C-alpha cells in the first residue's frame, strides 16, 4: 500500500514538471509574439515612408 502511495506522488510531481515545461514554452511563445509585433510595426513604418 505504501509503495503504491509513493508511485502516486511520483506521478503527481511528474505532471507538475509537465506543467512547468508548459509555462516555459508559453513564455518563449510570448517572446516570439513580441518580436512579430515589432515586425509588423516596422512594416507599418515602411508603408508610411513609401
Amino acid at each position: 500500500r505504501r509503495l503504491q502511495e509513493e508511485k502516486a506522488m511520483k506521478e503527481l510531481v511528474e505532471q507538475v514538471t509537465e506543467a512547468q515545461k508548459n509555462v516555459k514554452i508559453v513564455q518563449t511563445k510570448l517572446v516570439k509574439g513580441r518580436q512579430q509585433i515589432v515586425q509588423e510595426v516596422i512594416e507599418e513604418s515602411r508603408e508610411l515612408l513609401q
Binding site: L12, V16, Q27
Partner: protein
C-alpha cells in the same frame, strides 16, 4: 497613471519590505493610522505610484505578501505600521517550506499560486498602465526563492512588457544559514538568468563588516541591514518618485547598464556611511562622495571589484550641487584609473542628479554599477555544488519530492557556460 506594483516573498523579504514601507511612509509624511501628515510639495503629486487613491485621502499600500508560514504575518502585523496594509494580499499556506526549493515550488506552489495570481491580476487591472513589478526576496529558503522565481515567470508570461527587477540575497560560504543553500542557489540562478530582466546582489556579511568598521555600531542587528537596503532602494527609485533636472527610470537603466541579457547582475551601494560621532564632523562635497562611491570599502559586496574591469557604472545623485563636478570627476577617474574599466568602451559611468533631496538628510547618492567581482562568487558556488553533487549528499529529499536529478545536471551546465562567458568577457582585449 504610471504606477509600480510591489511584490513580497520570504521572511527576510517580508521584513525588508515592511522596513522600506515604513521608511517611505516616514519620509513622505504618512501617519501610522493611514491618513496624510506630510508637509512637502512633491509628496502629493506622484504619491500614487506606491499608493492608491481612496476616500478621505487614506492612501493604501500596494504590496502582495507571499509566504508559506503563518508565523511571519503575526510578527509583521504587530509592528507600528503592520495595521495599514491590506490583509487580503496576505496569502499564506499551512505547511512551511522546510528550506526546500523543490518541495516549496512543487507542493506549496500549486494550490496556493492561484490566489496570488488572482490578486496581482486584480491589482494590475485596477490601474490604467504599469511599468514593472518589484519583488524583494532572498535565496536562503524555500519561500522567497521557491515562489519568487515562479511568480516572476508567471508575470513575464502574462505581461512580457514589464520590468522584472529584484533584490534577491546571495549566499556566502563564510556566513551560511542553510545546509542545502548551494542547491537552492543553483536552482534559482537558472531562473534568474532565463526569466528575469535584471537582478541586484544583496549580501549580509558585507553589510555586517561595513557597519562594524565604519558605522561602529554597538549591537547591530537585522534591523540596521533592513534600514540600509530600504535606503538603497529608495535612492534607486527616487529617479521616478521625486523628479528633478535629469530624471531616469528603471527600464532606461536596465537597457543602458546591461550589455548582454545573460549578465544582468549589479552591485548597489550608498555613499554616506559614517559613524555617530562623525556626523557633526564632515565636509559635504563632490570629491568625497566620488571617493566613497568608487572605493571597495564602502561597497556592500562580499568580494573585491578590483580583480576585474568595470563594465557599466551609474552614479545617481540626490541633492542640489552641480553638473560640471560629476563629469570632471568621472573624466579624471577614467584617466588615472585606466586599468579598472573596459578600454574598448569609453565613458562607462552615467550621470544622474535628483534635485529633490531626501527627508532627514540633505546629501544622498547611490551607486549602481556592474563590476567584475561576482565572478569569484559564481566559481565558488559552482565548486561547492560540484563537491556536493559528486557523492550526491542531501539528495534523497529532493528525489523523494519527485523531480529527477537531470535538473541539477542542466543547471550546472548552464552555470559552467555562464562562468566561462564571464571570464572570457573579463579579458576584453582590443584586438588580436
Amino acid at each position: 497613471m504610471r504606477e509600480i506594483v510591489h511584490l513580497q516573498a520570504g521572511q527576510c523579504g517580508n521584513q525588508i519590505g515592511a522596513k522600506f514601507w515604513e521608511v517611505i511612509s516616514d519620509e513622505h509624511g504618512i501617519d501610522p493610522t493611514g491618513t496624510y501628515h506630510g508637509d512637502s510639495d512633491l509628496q502629493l503629486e506622484r504619491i500614487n505610484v506606491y499608493y492608491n487613491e481612496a476616500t478621505g485621502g487614506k492612501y493604501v499600500p500596494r504590496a502582495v505578501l507571499v509566504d508559506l508560514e503563518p508565523g511571519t504575518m503575526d510578527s509583521v502585523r504587530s509592528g507600528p505600521f503592520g495595521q495599514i496594509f491590506r490583509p487580503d494580499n496576505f496569502v499564506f499556506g499551512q505547511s512551511g517550506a522546510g528550506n526546500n526549493w523543490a518541495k516549496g515550488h512543487y507542493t506549496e506552489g500549486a494550490e496556493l499560486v492561484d490566489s496570488v495570481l488572482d490578486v496581482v491580476r486584480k491589482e494590475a487591472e485596477s490601474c490604467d498602465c504599469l511599468q514593472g513589478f518589484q519583488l524583494t526576496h532572498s535565496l536562503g529558503g524555500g519561500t522567497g526563492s521557491g515562489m519568487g522565481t515562479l511568480l516572476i515567470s508567471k508575470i513575464r508570461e502574462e505581461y512580457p512588457d514589464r520590468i522584472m527587477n529584484t533584490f534577491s540575497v546571495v549566499p556566502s560560504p563564510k556566513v551560511s544559514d542553510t545546509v542545502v543553500e548551494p542547491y537552492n542557489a543553483t536552482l534559482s540562478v537558472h531562473q534568474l538568468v532565463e526569466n528575469t530582466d535584471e537582478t541586484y546582489c544583496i549580501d549580509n556579511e558585507a553589510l555586517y563588516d561595513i557597519c562594524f568598521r565604519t558605522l561602529k555600531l554597538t549591537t547591530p542587528t537585522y534591523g540596521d541591514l533592513n534600514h540600509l537596503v530600504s535606503a538603497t532602494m529608495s535612492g534607486v527609485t527616487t529617479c521616478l518618485r521625486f523628479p528633478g533636472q535629469l530624471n531616469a527610470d528603471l527600464r532606461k537603466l536596465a537597457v543602458n547598464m546591461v550589455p548582454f541579457p545573460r549578465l544582468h547582475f549589479f552591485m548597489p551601494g550608498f555613499a554616506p556611511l559614517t559613524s555617530r560621532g562623525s556626523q557633526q564632523y564632515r565636509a559635504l562635497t563632490v570629491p568625497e562622495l566620488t571617493q566613497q562611491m568608487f572605493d571597495a570599502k564602502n561597497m556592500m559586496a562580499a568580494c573585491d571589484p578590483r580583480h576585474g574591469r568595470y563594465l557599466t557604472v551609474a552614479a545617481v545623485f540626490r541633492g542640489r550641487m552641480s553638473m560640471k563636478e560629476v563629469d570632471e570627476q568621472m573624466l579624471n577617474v577614467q584617466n588615472k584609473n585606466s586599468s579598472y574599466f573596459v578600454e574598448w568602451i569609453p565613458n562607462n559611468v552615467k550621470t544622474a542628479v535628483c534635485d529633490i533631496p531626501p527627508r532627514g538628510l540633505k546629501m544622498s547618492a547611490t551607486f549602481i554599477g556592474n563590476s567584475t567581482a561576482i565572478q569569484e562568487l559564481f566559481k565558488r558556488i559552482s565548486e561547492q555544488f560540484t563537491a556536493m553533487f559528486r557523492r550526491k549528499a542531501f539528495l534523497h529529499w529532493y528525489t523523494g519530492e519527485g523531480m529527477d536529478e537531470m535538473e541539477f545536471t542542466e543547471a550546472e551546465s548552464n552555470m559552467n557556460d555562464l562562468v566561462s562567458e564571464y571570464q572570457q568577457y573579463q579579458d576584453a582585449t582590443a584586438e588580436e
